[PDB]
Amino acid sequence: KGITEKSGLESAVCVTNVRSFTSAFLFSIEVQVTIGFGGRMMTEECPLAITVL
């Protein structure tokens, strides 16, 4: 849905705005050091992600 920008859909995703390993290794930074940049919320759905948090 980003190859073609027509969708713009982020209603059904496990962990928003994580798209690559670079982003994952910047999100983990935002969660460990209590920075919390917050362009990447954790929606409530996938409980495995919540366990990992």
Add this chain to the structure above:
Amino acid sequence: KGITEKSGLESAVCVTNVRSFTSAFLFSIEVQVTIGFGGRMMTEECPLAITVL
């Protein structure tokens, strides 16, 4: 882009919303004391920024 007519998503620079030395200083305060203000985020476009982080 402020001068021009079309925005073009600001072309997704190394670090969002840094326009001047004052903005960089504010961003540093945001990113160290763990304020994590969460308006001036950090993408992964350039890995040197991640190294600095």
